[PDB]
Design a protein around this ligand. Structure first.
Ligand SMILES: Cc1cc2nc3c(=O)[nH]c(=O)nc-3n(C[C@H](O)[C@H](O)[C@H](O)COP(=O)(O)OP(=O)(O)OC[C@H]3O[C@@H](n4cnc5c(N)ncnc54)[C@H](O)[C@@H]3O)c2cc1C
Ligand SMILES: NC(=O)c1nn(C[C@H](O)Cn2c3ccccc3c3ccccc32)c(=O)c2ccccc12
Length: 255
């Protein structure tokens, strides 16, 4: 527990909160880490886990991207909306109040092992992108400072969304990767289930995972490929079968 503050927030399509949280002097994390958060204004007692969508190289704030999907996220959305509307109407004398919260973390995920892999597939659906958002930014910081120091040779990125407007959560970051990725570390793939106004053609329908895995296996054999997944369990079963078929690294993270 650290008592800290939501100092700012963005209201992004598909009811998502781009929260900025004052980072305590002590709080070190790695990309892929999550924390538990308590907002006394919503519940004195409930803790909910959220991925840190920021990279730890950002120095005074952490970011969380939280989608309104039920009771507690709905209430935090409504609280942040209303506080922000009240400021449009008044919002003058002092600066933005700041919502008090408690944070517990960081907690680790096997996704952090990407930095020690040669070849990685990152697959995410909807807000499932957030740990991969942290990791992509961190790769950009680590490259402008130490391209030799890193053994990650290729990153295959697959991000699925039911709703086109959801790509806006991280379209800037994806733009910057298209800009700065002269050495083609990344292969970005956006599926609606260019169109992002990116140099990446937004694809449509369920990806052909069999065909993608076959291709990635031909590119990297006989070396090890690590699959990292953040999304629904029905997809996980399919990905797990394919990981066995082509000899890829899988972590069971879906039950
Ligand atoms: C490591 C980790 C990282 C996460 N990172 C993020 C992140 O970066 N961003 C993010 O937005 N979320 C993230 N989540 C999800 C998040 O932690 C929240 O608890 C959850 O997403 C919302 O809680 P809630 O009270 O708002 O919703 P709830 O009210 O719990 O509802 C959740 C879902 O379950 C359904 N549901 C509720 N009650 C029932 C019932 N009785 N029967 C059937 N269905 C029901 C709801 O309809 C809804 O679809 C993460 C989770 C973990 C474990
Ligand atoms: N690997 C994890 O830390 C982790 N992973 N999973 C599978 C999920 O990947 C974690 N996770 C979710 C689990 C359920 C719903 C949304 C999410 C989610 C949204 C964005 C980023 C991560 C998300 C868990 O269910 C889980 C549950 C309790 C504690 C940790 C986890």
């Amino acid at each position: 527990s650290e008592p800290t503050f939501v100092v700012n927030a963005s209201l992004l399509p598909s009811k998502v909160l781009g929260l900025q949280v004052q980072r305590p002097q002590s709080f070190n994390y790695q990309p892929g880490d999550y924390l538990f958060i308590k907002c006394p204004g919503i519940s004195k007692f409930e803790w909910h886990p959220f991925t840190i969508s920021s990279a730890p190289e950002m120095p005074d704030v952490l970011t969380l991207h939280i989608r309104a999907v039920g009771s507690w996220t709905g209430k935090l959305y409504q609280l942040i909306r209303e506080q922000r509307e009240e400021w449009i109407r008044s919002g003058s004398s002092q600066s933005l109040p700041g919502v008090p919260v408690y944070i517990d973390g960081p907690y680790g995920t096997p996704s952090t092992h990407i930095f020690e892999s040669k070849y990685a597939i990152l697959i995410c659906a909807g807000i499932g992108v957030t740990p991969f958002a942290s990791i992509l930014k961190s790769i950009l910081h680590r490259n402008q400072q130490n391209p030799a120091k890193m053994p990650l040779k290729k990153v295959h990125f697959y991000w699925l969304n039911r709703e086109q407007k959801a790509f806006e959560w991280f379209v800037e970051l994806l733009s910057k990767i298209e800009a700065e990725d002269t050495n083609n570390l990344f292969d970005l793939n956006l599926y609606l289930t260019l169109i992002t106004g990116l140099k990446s053609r937004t694809k449509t329908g369920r990806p052909d995972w069999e065909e993608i895995f076959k291709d990635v296996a031909k590119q990297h054999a006989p070396d090890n490929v690590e699959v990292f997944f953040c999304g629904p369990t029905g997809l996980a079963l399919q990905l797990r079968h394919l990981c066995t078929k082509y000899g890829f690294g899988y972590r069971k993270e879906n039950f």
